Design a protein around this ligand. Structure first.
Ligand SMILES: Cn1cc(C(N)=O)c(C(F)F)n1
Length: 165
């Protein structure tokens, strides 16, 4: 069956006020089938609110659109984000215990995005591993993909992953 619609939507901020449902659709249809595409407008003036949303038929199409950023739509670089926004580039990874190392976290998380920092947390007094880590990516979409998954398995551990700061 189909992925939930919420996970197939992209909120597009920073639109040109000249962008229309039709021009937004013509642009974003390059990366997949769009089941919905709307520019938000003022109810009285019909002047654009400068943002809108598109709904793809599949999550893989959302991924393709995000991987094709930056998007210049009607002459303006826009800001697409997956639907709920707390936009951050860093995650907390908990439940990794004492045997999880940098390469375990890198080999898994590098498939969500480009990693800039991996910080495996150690005890200030003893140096022993505390069983959690932070991963910083170059871009927020990695984190957005990560936190919507129900499960993360790293080094055989069932991990708790959340947005950090
Ligand atoms: C400066 N900066 C870059 C990003 C990004 N590419 O994802 C963010 C975050 F807020 F979305 N901040």
């Amino acid at each position: 069956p189909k992925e939930p619609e919420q996970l197939r939507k992209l909120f597009i901020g920073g639109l040109s006020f000249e962008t229309t449902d039709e021009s937004l659709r013509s642009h974003f249809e390059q990366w997949g089938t769009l089941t919905d595409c709307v520019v938000m407008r003022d109810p009285n003036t019909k002047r654009s609110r400068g943002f809108g949303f598109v709904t793809y038929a599949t999550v893989e199409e959302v991924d393709a659109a995000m991987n094709a950023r930056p998007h210049k739509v009607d002459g303006r670089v826009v800001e697409p984000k997956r639907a709920v926004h707390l936009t951050v580039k860093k995650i907390f990874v908990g439940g990794i215990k004492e045997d999880t190392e940098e390469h375990h976290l890198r080999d898994y998380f590098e498939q969500y995005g480009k990693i800039e920092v991996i910080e495996i947390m150690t005890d200030r007094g003893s140096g022993k591993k505390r069983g959690f880590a932070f991963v910083t990516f170059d871009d927020h979409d990695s984190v957005d993909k990560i936190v919507i998954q129900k499960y993360h398995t790293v080094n055989g551990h069932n991990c708790e992953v959340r947005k950090a700061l």
